[PDB]
Amino acid sequence: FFSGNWKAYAQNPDTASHIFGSGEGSGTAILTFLGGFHPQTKSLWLTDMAHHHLAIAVLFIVAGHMYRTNWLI
Amino acid sequence: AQSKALPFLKAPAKLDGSLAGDFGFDPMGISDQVANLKYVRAAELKHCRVAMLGFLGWVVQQYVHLPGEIYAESNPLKALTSVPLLSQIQIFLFIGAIELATLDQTYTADKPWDLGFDPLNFSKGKSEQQMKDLEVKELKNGRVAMIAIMGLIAQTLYTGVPLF
Amino acid sequence: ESTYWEGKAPPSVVLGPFLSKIPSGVLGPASLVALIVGSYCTHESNIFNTLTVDTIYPAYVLGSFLTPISWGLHVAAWIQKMNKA
Amino acid sequence: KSKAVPFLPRPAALDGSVVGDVGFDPVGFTSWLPLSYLQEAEIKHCRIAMLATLGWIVADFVHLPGAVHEVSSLAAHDVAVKSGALAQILIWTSIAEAISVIAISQMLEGSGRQPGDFKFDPLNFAKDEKSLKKMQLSELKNGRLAMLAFSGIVTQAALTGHAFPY
Ligand code: CLA
Ligand SMILES: C/C(C=C=C1C(C)(C)C[C@H](O)C[C@@]1(C)O)=C/C=C/C(C)=C/C=C/C=C(C)/C=C/C=C(/C=C/[C@@]12O[C@]1(C)C[C@@H](O)CC2(C)C)CO
Ligand SMILES: CC(/C=C/C=C(C)/C=C/[C@@]12O[C@]1(C)C[C@@H](O)CC2(C)C)=C\C=C\C=C(C)\C=C\C=C(C)\C=C\[C@@]12O[C@]1(C)C[C@@H](O)CC2(C)C
Numbered sequence: 001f002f003s004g005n006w007k008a009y010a011q012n013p014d015t016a017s018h019i020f021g022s023g024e025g026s027g028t029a030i031l032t033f034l035g036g037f038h039p040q041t042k043s044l045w046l047t048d049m050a051h052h053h054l055a056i057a058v059l060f061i062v063a064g065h066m067y068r069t070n071w072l073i
Numbered sequence: 074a075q076s077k078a079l080p081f082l083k084a085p086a087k088l089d090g091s092l093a094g095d096f097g098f099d100p101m102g103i104s105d106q107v108a109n110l111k112y113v114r115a116a117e118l119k120h121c122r123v124a125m126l127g128f129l130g131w132v133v134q135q136y137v138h139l140p141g142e143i144y145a146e147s148n149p150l151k152a153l154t155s156v157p158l159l160s161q162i163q164i165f166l167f168i169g170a171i172e173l174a175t176l177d178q179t180y181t182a183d184k185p186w187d188l189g190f191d192p193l194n195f196s197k198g199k200s201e202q203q204m205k206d207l208e209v210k211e212l213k214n215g216r217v218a219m220i221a222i223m224g225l226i227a228q229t230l231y232t233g234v235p236l237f
Numbered sequence: 238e239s240t241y242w243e244g245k246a247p248p249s250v251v252l253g254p255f256l257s258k259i260p261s262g263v264l265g266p267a268s269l270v271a272l273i274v275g276s277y278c279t280h281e282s283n284i285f286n287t288l289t290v291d292t293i294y295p296a297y298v299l300g301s302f303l304t305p306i307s308w309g310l311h312v313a314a315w316i317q318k319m320n321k322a
Numbered sequence: 323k324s325k326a327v328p329f330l331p332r333p334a335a336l337d338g339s340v341v342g343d344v345g346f347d348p349v350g351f352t353s354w355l356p357l358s359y360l361q362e363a364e365i366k367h368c369r370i371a372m373l374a375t376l377g378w379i380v381a382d383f384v385h386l387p388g389a390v391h392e393v394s395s396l397a398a399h400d401v402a403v404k405s406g407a408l409a410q411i412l413i414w415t416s417i418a419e420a421i422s423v424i425a426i427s428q429m430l431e432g433s434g435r436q437p438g439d440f441k442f443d444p445l446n447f448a449k450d451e452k453s454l455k456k457m458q459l460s461e462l463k464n465g466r467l468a469m470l471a472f473s474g475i476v477t478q479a480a481l482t483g484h485a486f487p488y
Pocket of ligand 3: 129215221235236
């Protein structure tokens, strides 16, 4: 994150044989684009939703500086 | 200009004169929202006193322990879990008993930090200048302790060494 | 003040006290340059070369952000030009 | 009309300032921004560049009170962000700059704070206004020279690998 090598958080995502709640077939990534659903739970990837909320957080924090307050801008 | 702590900024309107320890330190202008400085000073002084006691307890627990085994933990954060819940609930109940009357007191009084606590009468006979000097001493020591107790907690949570 | 307007163009005060003083001959070419740069950055990050995890290029991203911006710069350029600036 | 550029006219916003006003603004940036904000930015750049030039030069010559400090001020950045020193300097710099927002916002709004003024003269090197103006001009000239010098130092020390000559 500090080094800017943000791709490292997307390397080695959860495989297609991952059993939810267990380490079998898991990965190490935390923020990924995968799209679709988990092959086992038939639901969105947890790494997809974490990345989604991080992007939403950055966007809303940026957008929260729009209106004027005690600092002239 | 008017801040002594930040000699370049001008202090906010509510930071002036009285309420000892007033060094013009409010860059964010938090005092501009509070109706008065009574409640924030009460909170600051409560934090100062609790932090002084916390630092003293940190050091003493580092060096001195009660005869019992349950109080033999040297790490204060580990002692937070090793000590039986009975002792901690007794401490919490004592604090809450002290806190409810002062809860009635703080939100309305002119000097919410003045709890009338002076068993040794260290303030009887002292002049106004001496009393203000004592208040300044208390506030300084409390702010330094707050910084210190937070540093001790952080270094224990980050390295496991409770002291030095 | 009084950002309300009814003439041909709004007063320069609507641009803020940073764009209110830029000559239109500066904003115009700057807006065109920003639009071209942003379009090229967008077409280089995507379209011409497909995006990949290993190829994000903050320059192209930051660049692409100049396309939305460009819109604002040339709007301000027109406002300045119509206000004799 | 300009003192620095005889061809181009004198900038409209530059009439007199003890910061070294020689009327050098060919692109008219002083018309864009308030002059005070630009002066604060220039003084900040001056001080940062002077500190950085001195630090680069010194740290390449005598800087090793340990093991991790055995670098050549070109690989020093990565080594010492791994060590954790740059993190602490960044924390304190961020605190100072966050305070500086209010200082910049208290000016440009009223008050009386001159650009770049932090009331930091513990040794009282400046006594009166004349000394203050003379040393403000001296500080800004030294800071501009240090900006250019540090630019040269980094560009040369990245175009090759060497010592003080670079
Ligand atoms: C519980 C903490 C606490 C509280 C409630 C106060 C409250 C007050 N302080 Mg104070 N102070 C504190 C801690 C605190 N202080 C510490 C630790 C220091 C030492 C640096 C000081 C140093 C100080 C000076 C020098 C002065 C004051 C003054 C004041 C008064 C006016 C400012 C105000 O309204 O801010 C209210 C403050 C809060 C509501 C706290 C908000 C919490 C912020 C967001 C802190 C965020 C964390 C922080 C950035 C980092 C902490 C982590 C770690 C590094 C410590 C007010 C009674 C001024 C005074 O006397 O006026 C009468 C004054 O001149 N304070
Ligand atoms: C203990 C230690 C290290 C070590 C040791 C041992 C125990 C000693 C020995 C062992 O053998 C090894 C080891 C590792 O353990 C000590 C570390 C060194 C320290 C403690 C020195 C810190 C350096 C300070 C710097 C480099 C700060 C730079 C200043 C800036 C200012 C920025 C400004 O922009 C701001 C924000 C406002 C502007 O207006 C103007 C200015 C002021 C210019 C950054 O630009
Ligand atoms: C306890 C204290 C004061 C206690 C006073 C009390 C109870 C007085 C009570 C009374 O007067 C009243 C109220 C009313 C009177 O009628 C009755 C009595 C009863 C007489 C002040 C402490 C004040 C404590 C202070 C100021 C502490 C500062 C601590 C620092 C700087 C520590 C730094 C470090 O801990 C770090 C940060 C990291 C470590 O690794 C390294 C080091 C260096 C050890």
